[PDB]
């Protein structure tokens, strides 16, 4: 619960019965995780980053545990190089950025 | 506090920065290794670099030892200049203003 930024802020997540590592990312609007199957229905979405846009699958109301905190919300699945926890779920677990 | 704000993440964590004499808005971004600013003029030597993120890579100019004011806090470090859609303050400078994640 107090994470400095001299290293990447990586945490463990539990999603679709798997443990994975993910990046706590205040610069991401959305949560984007590498290809895997999830227990739900999806719809298409386009999202942008540095370097253009990618197609992802949008899964709503997904149960995901981040550093032991449970969230239930939208997870995007697509060709990201790193699993990213964005503000939609950072807010659910009560994360803040402090000076 | 006003001098050391606790920033909630309901909205994008945007702040005012001053760089190269100019005021700009930038994103405080714990998920970025580097600080990347839109095309602008900076002094000194630079070297070309490729940096990547979600969509792929962009070519930037790397400048070292740049002074930047971030929400009124002084930080010095490398700044990459290039075709980023959003100015972002990455971990190399967030550490210099004592930023932490808390939950
Ligand atoms: C994740 C998504 C919802 C698409 N949002 C974003 O990606 C938004 C888009 C915004 C507008 C365009 C400019 C970027 C800002 C902030 N970003 C969030 C932002 O936090 C984003 C998230 C991220 C992390 C790691 C890998 C990829 C993507 N970081 C980045 O784009 C930074 C840029 C940099 N410093 O070089 N990338 C990295 O720090 C980084 C780290 C490891 C990597 C490994 C392999 C390939 C690329 C890698 N890039
Ligand atoms: Cl959500
Ligand atoms: Cl630096």
Curated annotation (Swiss-Prot), chain B:
Entry superkingdom: Viruses
Secretion signal span: none
Marked site positions, Cleavage: 4-5
Region spans: Dimerization of protease: 5-9, 53-59, 92-103
Active site positions, chain numbering: 29
Residue ranges occupied by any Peptidase A2 domain in the UniProt entry: 24-93
Summary of subunit composition and partner proteins: Homodimer, whose active site consists of two apposed aspartic acid residues.
Name of the protein in its database record: Protease
Annotated organism of origin: Human immunodeficiency virus type 1 group M subtype B (isolate BRU/LAI)
Organism placement in taxonomy: Viruses, Riboviria, Pararnavirae, Artverviricota, Revtraviricetes
